[PDB]
């Protein structure tokens, strides 16, 4: 079927829903927190790659905190389809085969409001032949996300 794993909430949060990535989950960066309005889209949509990664990071966090075993591969083999969209990474595989910019699940981009501090859901930074795309090559993607940010900010 589709992913049923819901992201677990920590204890020192102001609104039930948001998710945070520690400084050890991000390379050359400090911790970053994302609001409930953004991560809520992870339960609705099926197509977001960054959501698939949050469910992987959360599952790894929950499995370490609650169990003891590194033959823990048997566990992920059961849970894979409940955390990620298998066809979503097949889509990226198809794009790579067709010389189309694809997502290798490493870098993501998002829009961050200057004074509100509110952020969009991080979308995947595409790559083509071993180099990420310039901002100039997906600027209309960023423009569309900025429009969705305004209509969400009004609501």
């Amino acid at each position: 079927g589709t992913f049923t794993w819901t992201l677990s909430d920590s204890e020192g949060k102001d609104t039930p829903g948001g998710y945070c990535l520690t400084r050890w989950m991000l390379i050359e960066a400090e911790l970053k927190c994302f609001g409930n309005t953004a991560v809520a889209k992870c339960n609705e949509k099926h197509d977001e790659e960054f959501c698939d990664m949050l469910r992987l990071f959360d599952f790894n966090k929950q499995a370490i905190q609650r169990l003891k075993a590194q033959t823990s591969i048997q566990l992920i083999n059961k849970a894979v389809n409940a955390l990620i969209n298998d066809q979503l990474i097949m889509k990226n595989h198809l794009r790579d085969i067709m010389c189309i910019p694809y997502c290798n699940y490493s870098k993501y981009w998002y829009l961050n409001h200057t004074t509100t501090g509110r952020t969009s859901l991080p979308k995947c930074w595409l790559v083509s032949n071993g180099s990420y795309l310039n901002e100039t090559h997906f600027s209309d993607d960023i423009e569309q996300q900025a429009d969705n940010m305004i209509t969400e900010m009004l609501q």
Binding site: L26, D86, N104, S106, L111, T119, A146
Partner: protein
């Protein structure tokens, strides 16, 4: 730095997949020849493409290896997912193995479009998702070709190997669905 609508600043983040080592395997590449899959912080598997062979006998004593339960069960599970994910594998001769003492080592003879070398390279392309194109020389085109003659898979110990591409579980997780999806009748 880069502003949109005067109030939305373009910001990025890069995930460090290395912290997922205890739950799932992680694929990555060192150079053109060597690629790796890491299971935990100790064991692992080394996919190397070499014109030099490592096994000369054309037998694979899997039943013997199963009975003498020495090998790491995790590495055996990912070596099974690889061989099953090969599509249209019909030349069992190229498959030669040596599991003496738990030391798992599998060699695919690519020397033997439509050949058995394509299906093994297609599965290798998926497995080490980051940085597989470097070894392929293929570009975009189904049919994959390489100068190298052998794909050797050996058990190895963990080191700072991921030099060209970052570690990722995306490769392994994708083969799980397309596991037994394309196999002929035996």
């Amino acid at each position: 730095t880069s502003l949109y609508k005067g109030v939305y600043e373009l910001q990025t983040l890069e995930l460090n997949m290395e912290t997922l080592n205890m739950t799932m395997p992680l694929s990555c590449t060192k150079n053109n020849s060597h690629h790796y899959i890491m299971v935990g912080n100790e064991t692992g598997l080394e996919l190397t493409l070499t014109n030099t062979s490592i096994i000369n006998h054309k037998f694979c004593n899997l039943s013997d290896a199963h009975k003498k339960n020495l090998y790491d069960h995790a590495l055996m599970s990912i070596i099974s997912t690889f061989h099953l994910s090969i599509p249209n594998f019909n030349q069992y001769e190229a498959m030669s193995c040596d599991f003496n003492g738990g030391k798992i080592s599998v060699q695919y003879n690519l020397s033997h479009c439509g050949t058995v070398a394509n299906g093994v390279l297609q599965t290798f392309m998926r497995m080490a998702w980051g940085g597989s194109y470097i070894a392929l020389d293929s570009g975009c085109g189904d049919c994959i070709m390489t100068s190298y003659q052998y794909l050797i898979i050996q058990n190895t110990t963990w080191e700072d190997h991921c030099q060209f591409s970052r570690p990722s579980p995306i490769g392994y997780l994708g083969l799980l669905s397309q596991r037994t999806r394309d196999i002929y009748i035996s």
